Amino acid sequence: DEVARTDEWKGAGVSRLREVWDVQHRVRLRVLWYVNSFWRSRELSYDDHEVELYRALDAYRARIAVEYVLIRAVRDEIYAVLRRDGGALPQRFACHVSRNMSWRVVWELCRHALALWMDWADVRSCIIKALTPRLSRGAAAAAQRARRQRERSAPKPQELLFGPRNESGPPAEQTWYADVVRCVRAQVDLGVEVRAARCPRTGLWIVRDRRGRLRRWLSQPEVCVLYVTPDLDFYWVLPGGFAVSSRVTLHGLAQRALRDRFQNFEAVLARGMHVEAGRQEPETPRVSGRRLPFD
Amino acid sequence: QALTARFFVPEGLVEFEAQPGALLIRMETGCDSPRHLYISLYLLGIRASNVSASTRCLLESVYTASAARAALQWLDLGPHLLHRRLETLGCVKTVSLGITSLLTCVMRGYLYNVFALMIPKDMYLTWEETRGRLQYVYLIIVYDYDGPETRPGIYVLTSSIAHWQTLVDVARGKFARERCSFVNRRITRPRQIPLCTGVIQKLGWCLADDIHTSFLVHKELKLSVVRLDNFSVELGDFREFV
Amino acid sequence: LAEAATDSILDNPTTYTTSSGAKISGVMVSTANVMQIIMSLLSSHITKETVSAPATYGNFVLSPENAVTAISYHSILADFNSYKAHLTSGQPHLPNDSLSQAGAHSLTPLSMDVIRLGEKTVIMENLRRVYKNTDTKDPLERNVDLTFFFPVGLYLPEDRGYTTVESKVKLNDTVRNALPTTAYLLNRDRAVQKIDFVDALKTLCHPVLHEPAPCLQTFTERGPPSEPAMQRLLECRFQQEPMGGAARRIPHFYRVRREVPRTVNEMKQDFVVTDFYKVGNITLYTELHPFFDFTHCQENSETVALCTPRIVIGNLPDGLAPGPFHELRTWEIMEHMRLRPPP
Amino acid sequence: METHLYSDLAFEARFADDEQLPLHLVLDQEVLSNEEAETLRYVYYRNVDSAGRSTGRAPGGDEDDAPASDDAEDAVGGDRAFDRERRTWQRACFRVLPRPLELLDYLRQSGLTVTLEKEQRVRMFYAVFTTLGLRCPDNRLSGAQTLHLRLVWPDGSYRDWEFLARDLLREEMEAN
Amino acid sequence: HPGFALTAVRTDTFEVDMLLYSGKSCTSVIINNPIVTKEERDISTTYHVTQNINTVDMGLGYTSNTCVAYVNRVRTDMGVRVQDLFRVFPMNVYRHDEVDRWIRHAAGVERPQLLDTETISMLTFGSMSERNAAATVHGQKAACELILTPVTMDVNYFKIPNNPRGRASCMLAVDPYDTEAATKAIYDHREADAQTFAATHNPWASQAGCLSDVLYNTRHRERLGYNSKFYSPCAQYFNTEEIIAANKTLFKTIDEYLLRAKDCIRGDTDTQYVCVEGTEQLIENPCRLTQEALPILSTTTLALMETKLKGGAGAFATSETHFGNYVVGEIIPLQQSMLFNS
Amino acid sequence: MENWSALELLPKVGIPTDFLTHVKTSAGEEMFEALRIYYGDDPERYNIH
Amino acid sequence: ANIFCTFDHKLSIADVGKLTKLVAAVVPIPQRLHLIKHYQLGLHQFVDHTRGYVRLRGLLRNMTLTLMRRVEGNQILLHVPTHGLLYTVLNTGPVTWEKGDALCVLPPLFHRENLLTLGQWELVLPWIVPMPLALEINQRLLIMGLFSLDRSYEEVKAAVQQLQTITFRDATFTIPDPVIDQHLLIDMKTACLSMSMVANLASELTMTYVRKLALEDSSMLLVKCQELLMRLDRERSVGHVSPDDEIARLSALFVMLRQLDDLIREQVVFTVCDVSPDNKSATCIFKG
Amino acid sequence: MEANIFCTFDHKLSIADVGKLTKLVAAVVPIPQRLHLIKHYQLGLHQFVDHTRGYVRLRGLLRNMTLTLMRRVEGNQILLHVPTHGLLYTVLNTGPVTWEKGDALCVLPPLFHGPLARENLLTLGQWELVLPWIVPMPLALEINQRLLIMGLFSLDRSYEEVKAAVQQLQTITFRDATFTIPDPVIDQHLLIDMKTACLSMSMVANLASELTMTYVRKLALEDSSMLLVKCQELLMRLDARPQHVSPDDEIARLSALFVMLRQLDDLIREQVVFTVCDVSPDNKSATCIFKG
Structure with missing residues (x-):
């Protein structure tokens, strides 16, 4: 009568246990080898020549640089536009200001701020946090729809008199992400989700917390802020609400390089979520150690 | 109201069963004249894999009687086929003693104006500890496949769950050992074809405050029981689950 | 008690009156014990009477017009004939209601006990007879319950200690007498019972006390306060600087002439004991849990809620667990280890 | 345990089809913190050859090799690239043990008999038991292959690590 | 002495005799000639007789008054035993199994048990995880639902009838139906409490999210896992939802007190269990309406207890103070006279 | 949802009303379920449907 | 509770005598009217040569089954029973009964008095059978159905000959072959192909569904499922699936097992506690 | 024990409520606890329904509630009678389903009706008298099959490919009326059924004899027909004398296959509660026997 795979698997047991680290040397984890795995019966080969390791390390260099290259591209665009317009920049974010002030010190503080931001370039940043929704499948159709509907001639009268309503394209509130740098105590705020609105009185921008409260930056001389829009417009603003603006340029990368890295996840259905598309959901299952385990 | 039937049994089977309250089962064996032999849970406790050794030996001494041996010997051939060989006849209310005895059991009824159903202790278990107001009660057989041969377990259990599907859903939950042992038997030896892991029969409903624990005596020997003080009988079919 | 009850909508003025003496104002009903106590206590005011009572129930029958309106519209308007006649004639008022039109004119006499309460004459019933030998409790036998509370382990300030009973009781100098770590109660009958902290262990050891997960959850949910004094309380910055050149970098932090905000925990330590509970204690919205610290602080210039355990009991706020109390706990520890004459 | 055994079985059923061999891994309080291991929803892995090419594609490149489009009607190969990327990730099996344990004591409480060379017994606050497959281009493993570990939580956030096969197999295989 | 202090809360039931007043023809009783219904069998026949009473109230104020005139017995032990918090929250355990078992043994509790599944909780009226004691010469187990308390809570708070949570919460003072103002009154700590003007006398109980609040508010219990059969004295002070729900007008809250706010407690079991069969009588709870608790005789040392038994x-x-030893005197003269004079 | 207009038009019987507390307090504190209070003479009752 | 039935034809004294012999039989009718015509009584209305057993089994399950009563002049009374009440039923089946049996009904298969005929209409009553015999004979007929395509081989001929005969306590049978003219009827055809295809569908589907289920909470019973599936796959080798295709296959599995429910389920109708010494008739409790 | 269940209503019911509740005599209303004196707040399915949670749990709670017939509605007392097994009772249907003769009826939680009326019966406060649907067997086992198959298919599928399938699977047409399955969440209450189904399918796959496996291919060698062609297309891309023959082998293997198919079928089945007799022509009410 038959021997069972699990029984000989148990009785054979294991004898191998070692820890391995990720290439960045940031995480450790254990690998276990069972003496009844079919790995031992296979008797296949192994090769670890130096050229292959060198090529893999070059691929890793690209994988790492995918974010810092976007940082560098936006930096170079900032400087290029700063020379382009002669450095004299208009007001773009609304706040009251004085003509009798030492603007030179704020210019030097701006230099300090951009240098300090360049040092603290990181994977979490407004450019990456704005890129990530751009990669999702909906963004192509959504931006296509937004451009198409924006590209609408003024309605003929019968269109407005009859049928389903006419509508306005954008909502009154914009969704933004920003990088906040403070020089008086070297400190940079990168993972910021922020709301923005374009003022009706003047065409300038008012910026709000994700509570409805106004932000404090424009008043504080020691702070500079970077802004990116959901359509990837871009601003670098120094105290007084004066900003440098340009496109976020990303033609310096191939599609797969950034796409494989920053692909936002989409779920596959597992216990504790509704089969109807996008329906409301209960609180998470969370198999947990604080309660007596169920079967 | 109640419906009654009359039966003949010989004394050797009746001895410990002679007390008024019991549950009666019929054995069919491929013999020629004694095809059907009438046995009870008191005798079946000898082969119940879930009863303790001391009570097992107590019943072994109690049913040394000659006919009970041959009755027990017929249980040997086929553990998986046990519930096939069994058929149930309700619970007993009458007794007259003799070499050949006349006893009566009800198939569907109660006693107007005492009528209890006795259970040997290790045959009893509950999935509740605060009893519901109305308790449905069952005879269930579960098979232990993890061995050199399969051994049968016997239980009578009380539960308020009336719907069969949810009932078996929880029974599988607590009897997962027998499911896994069944599949272990299947993976081990495909030569003999095993049937279900457990068998349910529905017979009864009672009120929780009318459930008593009781002490029982026969032949100056003494065994303790759980009893359903006012038993209502509604005999169902054996139903299988894996 | 009697005068508070408002008089009825109506009355048969001839029903339930003492044959010659008085009109009955109300009836008082209570169990045999209370009624007997009253009969013994207020003996001078209690007297036996014979009163005129209605011999039979009032028989109310309905008009056929009411039957028709009932079948059609599902309603009654009692004494339909009277309403119709008064609306036809133009009379404003009706002489009596539908229920004064019942229970009438059959008086037979019965004898009761009565009590005099000024103008009021009141009947007294001891409903013993109606319930004896029966299986139901008298509905005037009631269960009432109360909620009680008492402290244990509470500690009195040493700064203002006083005695009111010095000549009555004198205690040994020991620290156990000094520090109130137990409490004593009375049983259902007057007998002494004692609660130590040991008796509390069945509750105080439960994980539910020690898990602030709902505490932190609702601390975050409520949101930070918008009041300007609280607003200056909210600001606080923490971050994890690298430790590599930590020593050599120390002077560069002080080169910057910028003062730093006190943490909430730092501010909480200057409120003296007697006013830690007052409104002027800004930090009070923080103090949710004895074992745990809560705070709002900043990261990424966002305001977040931080929770952290008070590893040692010394970390408790001074206002809630003062220093002299710690000195007394240390003296209790030394007394327990019999070191109170410290080597 | 049970996931390791089950996946070692399941990979054998599809060794010829997938050309992947099973690899059994354990995670602790140094890879992810307690609440993350308590609320973990998915685990995914993705293979990379020594040349930096994913396995959801033919070696001879793909149309995704093009530079970024920067368009708006197309985002970056909007649907095509997204679906190819969803193709290039495979899903692994996992189990969570929400209690502190000694790994050898847990395994001997289980049916196994761990026969390690000396008492380097290790303690951990919690354990999750993942298992991954790594691919055989031919019946051989390239030491410069890279294998990626991805972990996803109910809020859709994810963590991503990558390991090169040489460290896993350093002398597990060259001795074999 | 650990680094904190405790305050206990317990509910004791009294069996009482009450006297009632009612004026002549307070209400009219309408009755019908009885209806007879028949069920017959071949062994015995049974008759069911029915008669309907309709009572029409015949006054515009309150025509009847009651008062709790007399009492002689306490159904509860007046004990000081602590609630078994493990039984009410049964599923929860410590992370490390060894320390969990150590705590279970040290504090004397059984193993954790799974709660009854929703289908079972529907089919049977509660789990009742705690059994009857073998004997009890005293009455029911008046379980004290302890709440935590700073070491230096103001001693005077315990000498008069107060809310044990440390803040005023009687919804008679708040303007009716102003739920916003009522939640402000119960939870705001920049507006002082209405009873003992201050932010709070217990900062670990009186504000949302305190350990007392999550322990004893039924909402936080519902978010957790617990057994609802176990009646808890402390719940009536912390159940924000129906405290606010009672914030109505004067006469409606009087009618709710006398009709709806009554408690139901099983009379047979030692542990105070809730009851919904209706066959059991309801219990009058003045503390619910007043939303306060009563102080009871307690003392630190046997010296003061003995000198009060002596006098x-x-x-x-009276309430008395020694250097570090306090006495809390009972606010109604219950124990010495009212119970035992009988 | 009472027929207050019918109550106004229908004949009525007079009683010496005795409120425990002042009538406007009894109405304002809603000792009575269902109410209607109006001031002056409100002509709502002068039409019949 | 009564049902009346009238015969259109005449009735000789011999025919009414032949009828009264059945005064305790189990006579079913398609549905319950107060008065029914004689055609609907019995299974005769369903006896088309092209259909046979399996469909008639489900028809007998669906119909109402009644007991007979003593007869008026030209009109027979049928007594519809009630649950939990005892009645006297006559054993028309060729089996002996014992006090305590569970009884089931199935259409007749192996048949002078049966010609209770009033011209080309015959009162074919159902069989009353002890439940284990009914289950086993259902199994045996179904297995005969499976060999139907291979009758050319001599050993399977002998196997069928052995299957057909069943022996019971003092009883023997010869069960007719479900194939006529070496061809299979349509109801048996559907039943057997559906059984075979649910087997095949299980074999194909369970391998992918065990993985799809295993990702979440894989456990020992599922591992045993995997072991048996792998061995079955290897033993069958002796020598990226689209959504809608999977939907079709999964639906087909369940609809196929739904067709089998006629032969899978075996419900009880009568349980007996009495028997005549003559064994001509018994008394039973009614079920179902 | 007690054959009559008394329901007490806690409101001063007006003419409208007492009239419209009189309109529902001999309707089926579910009761949890089966006791003498019961309050209206624990009558019907109102407390057990919660849209954020699944239809599966509502069905599970419904199977265990007991059924009663409503009669003799009088002042604040509703007098529910419990039907006894094997007697003749009249019932009033709630859903738009049409009842034939001979059909067996099973109880299911109400569905989302095609034009979504719901007709707002008895909203006496925050409460509402939610009644279950009484449905004939084919539709009940059809919807159980649909829920189970939707759970089986849905796992490990992303949402976008799910949507197209479920929009086709969710809607069931039956006797010219069409209904939608409301809330098919993948609950662990459904995982238990799926696990049992998977085990049963594996077992029936394993122990089936070689002849049972080979029959349809032998039939394709034998015959050609539309049903067989559809089966062939079903098996298309997944695709002599027996090595030894024996009858008793087939008996044993087939009996095991039957017990396993019984498990798998039971996962679809629901327990019958009524068998119908000839029906009032307006579908309003039918006469039925109470089964179980």
Whole structure:
């Protein structure tokens, strides 16, 4: 009568246990080898020549640089536009200001701020946090729809008199992400989700917390802020609400390089979520150690 | 109201069963004249894999009687086929003693104006500890496949769950050992074809405050029981689950 | 008690009156014990009477017009004939209601006990007879319950200690007498019972006390306060600087002439004991849990809620667990280890 | 345990089809913190050859090799690239043990008999038991292959690590 | 002494005799000639007889008054035993199994048990995880639902009838139906409490998210896992939802007190269990309406207890202080006179 | 949802009303379920449907 | 509770005598009217040569089954029973009964008095059978159905000959072959192909569904499922699936097992506690 | 024990409520606890329904509630009678389903009706008298099959490919009326059924004899027909004398296959509660026997 795979698997047991680290040397984890795995019966080969390791390390260099290259591209665009317009920049974010002030010190503080931001370039940043929704499948159709509907001639009268309503394209509130740098105590705020609105009185921008409260930056001389829009417009603003603006340029990368890295996840259905598309959901299952385990 | 039937049994089977309250089962064996032999849970406790050794030996001494041996010997051939060989006849209310005895059991009824159903202790278990107001009660057989041969377990259990599907859903939950042992038997030896892991029969409903624990005596020997003080009988079919 | 009850909508003025003496104002009903106590206590005011009572129930029958309106519209308007006649004639008022039109004119006499309460004459019933030998409790036998509370382990300030009973009781100098770590109660009958902290262990050891997960959850949910004094309380910055050149970098932090905000925990330590509970204690919205610290602080210039355990009991706020109390706990520890004459 | 055994079985059923061999891994309080291991929803892995090419594609490149489009009607190969990327990730099996344990004591409480060379017994606050497959281009493993570990939580956030096969197999295989 | 202090809360039931007043023809009783219904069998036949009563109230105020005139027995032990918090929250355990078992043994509790599945909780009326004691010469187990308390909570708070949570919460003072103002009154700590003007006398109970609040508010219990059969004295002070729900007008809250706010407690079991069969009588709870608790005789050392037992009747009423030893005198002269004079 | 207009038009019987507390307090504190209070003479009752 | 039935034809004294012999039989009718015509009584209305057993089994399950009563002049009374009440039923089946049996009904298969005929209409009553015999004979007929395509081989001929005969306590049978003219009827055809295809569908589907289920909470019973599936796959080798295709296959599995429910389920109708010494008739409790 | 269940209503019911509740005599209303004196707040399915949670749990709670017939509605007392097994009772249907003769009826939680009326019966406060649907067997086992198959298919599928399938699977047409399955969440209450189904399918796959496996291919060698062609297309891309023959082998293997198919079928089945007799022509009410 038959021997069972699990029984000989148990009785054979294991004898191998070692820890391995990720290439960045940031995480450790254990690998276990069972003496009844079919790995031992296979008797296949192994090769670890130096050229292959060198090529893999070059691929890793690209994988790492995918974010810092976007940082560098936006930096170079900032400087290029700063020379382009002669450095004299208009007001773009609304706040009251004085003509009798030492603007030179704020210019030097701006230099300090951009240098300090360049040092603290990181994977979490407004450019990456704005890129990530751009990669999702909906963004192509959504931006296509937004451009198409924006590209609408003024309605003929019968269109407005009859049928389903006419509508306005954008909502009154914009969704933004920003990088906040403070020089008086070297400190940079990168993972910021922020709301923005374009003022009706003047065409300038008012910026709000994700509570409805106004932000404090424009008043504080020691702070500079970077802004990116959901359509990837871009601003670098120094105290007084004066900003440098340009496109976020990303033609310096191939599609797969950034796409494989920053692909936002989409779920596959597992216990504790509704089969109807996008329906409301209960609180998470969370198999947990604080309660007596169920079967 | 109640419906009654009359039966003949010989004394050797009746001895410990002679007390008024019991549950009666019929054995069919491929013999020629004694095809059907009438046995009870008191005798079946000898082969119940879930009863303790001391009570097992107590019943072994109690049913040394000659006919009970041959009755027990017929249980040997086929553990998986046990519930096939069994058929149930309700619970007993009458007794007259003799070499050949006349006893009566009800198939569907109660006693107007005492009528209890006795259970040997290790045959009893509950999935509740605060009893519901109305308790449905069952005879269930579960098979232990993890061995050199399969051994049968016997239980009578009380539960308020009336719907069969949810009932078996929880029974599988607590009897997962027998499911896994069944599949272990299947993976081990495909030569003999095993049937279900457990068998349910529905017979009864009672009120929780009318459930008593009781002490029982026969032949100056003494065994303790759980009893359903006012038993209502509604005999169902054996139903299988894996 | 009697005068508070408002008089009825109506009355048969001839029903339930003492044959010659008085009109009955109300009836008082209570169990045999209370009624007997009253009969013994207020003996001078209690007297036996014979009163005129209605011999039979009032028989109310309905008009056929009411039957028709009932079948059609599902309603009654009692004494339909009277309403119709008064609306036809133009009379404003009706002489009596539908229920004064019942229970009438059959008086037979019965004898009761009565009590005099000024103008009021009141009947007294001891409903013993109606319930004896029966299986139901008298509905005037009631269960009432109360909620009680008492402290244990509470500690009195040493700064203002006083005695009111010095000549009555004198205690040994020991620290156990000094520090109130137990409490004593009375049983259902007057007998002494004692609660130590040991008796509390069945509750105080439960994980539910020690898990602030709902505490932190609702601390975050409520949101930070918008009041300007609280607003200056909210600001606080923490971050994890690298430790590599930590020593050599120390002077560069002080080169910057910028003062730093006190943490909430730092501010909480200057409120003296007697006013830690007052409104002027800004930090009070923080103090949710004895074992745990809560705070709002900043990261990424966002305001977040931080929770952290008070590893040692010394970390408790001074206002809630003062220093002299710690000195007394240390003296209790030394007394327990019999070191109170410290080597 | 049970996931390791089950996946070692399941990979054998599809060794010829997938050309992947099973690899059994354990995670602790140094890879992810307690609440993350308590609320973990998915685990995914993705293979990379020594040349930096994913396995959801033919070696001879793909149309995704093009530079970024920067368009708006197309985002970056909007649907095509997204679906190819969803193709290039495979899903692994996992189990969570929400209690502190000694790994050898847990395994001997289980049916196994761990026969390690000396008492380097290790303690951990919690354990999750993942298992991954790594691919055989031919019946051989390239030491410069890279294998990626991805972990996803109910809020859709994810963590991503990558390991090169040489460290896993350093002398597990060259001795074999 | 650990680094904190405790305050206990317990509910004791009294069996009482009450006297009632009612004026002549307070209400009219309407009755019908009885209806007879028949069920017949071949062995015996049974008759069911029915008669309907309709009572029409015949006054515009309150025509009847009651008062709890007399009492002689306490159904509860007046004990000081602590609630078994493990039984009410049964599923929860410590992370490390060894320390969990150590705590279970040290504090004397059984193993954790899974709660009854929703289908079972529907089919049977509660789990009742705690059994009857073998004997009890005293009455029911008046379980004290302890709440935590700073070491230096103001001693005077316990000498008069107060809310044990440390803040005023009687919804008679708040303007009716102003739920916003009522939640402000119960939870705001920049507006002082209405009873003992201050932010709070217990900062670990009186504000949302305190350990007392999550322990004893039924909402936080519902978010957790617990057994609802176990009646808890402390819940009536912390159940924000129906405290606010009672914020109605004067006469409606009087009618709710006398009709709806009554408690139901099983009379047979030692542990105070809730009851919904209706066959059991309801219980009158003045503390619910007043939303306060009563102080009871308690003392630190046997010295003061003995000197109060020594002195003449009435010494129980006073509250006394020794250097570090306090006495809390009972606010109503219950224990010494009212119970035992009978 | 009472027929207050019918109550106004229908004949009525007079009683010496005795409120425990002042009538406007009894109405304002809603000792009575269902109410209607109006001031002056409100002509709502002068039409019949 | 009564049902009346009238015969259109005449009735000789011999025919009414032949009828009264059945005064305790189990006579079913398609549905319950107060008065029914004689055609609907019995299974005769369903006896088309092209259909046979399996469909008639489900028809007998669906119909109402009644007991007979003593007869008026030209009109027979049928007594519809009630649950939990005892009645006297006559054993028309060729089996002996014992006090305590569970009884089931199935259409007749192996048949002078049966010609209770009033011209080309015959009162074919159902069989009353002890439940284990009914289950086993259902199994045996179904297995005969499976060999139907291979009758050319001599050993399977002998196997069928052995299957057909069943022996019971003092009883023997010869069960007719479900194939006529070496061809299979349509109801048996559907039943057997559906059984075979649910087997095949299980074999194909369970391998992918065990993985799809295993990702979440894989456990020992599922591992045993995997072991048996792998061995079955290897033993069958002796020598990226689209959504809608999977939907079709999964639906087909369940609809196929739904067709089998006629032969899978075996419900009880009568349980007996009495028997005549003559064994001509018994008394039973009614079920179902 | 007690054959009559008394329901007490806690409101001063007006003419409208007492009239419209009189309109529902001999309707089926579910009761949890089966006791003498019961309050209206624990009558019907109102407390057990919660849209954020699944239809599966509502069905599970419904199977265990007991059924009663409503009669003799009088002042604040509703007098529910419990039907006894094997007697003749009249019932009033709630859903738009049409009842034939001979059909067996099973109880299911109400569905989302095609034009979504719901007709707002008895909203006496925050409460509402939610009644279950009484449905004939084919539709009940059809919807159980649909829920189970939707759970089986849905796992490990992303949402976008799910949507197209479920929009086709969710809607069931039956006797010219069409209904939608409301809330098919993948609950662990459904995982238990799926696990049992998977085990049963594996077992029936394993122990089936070689002849049972080979029959349809032998039939394709034998015959050609539309049903067989559809089966062939079903098996298309997944695709002599027996090595030894024996009858008793087939008996044993087939009996095991039957017990396993019984498990798998039971996962679809629901327990019958009524068998119908000839029906009032307006579908309003039918006469039925109470089964179980």
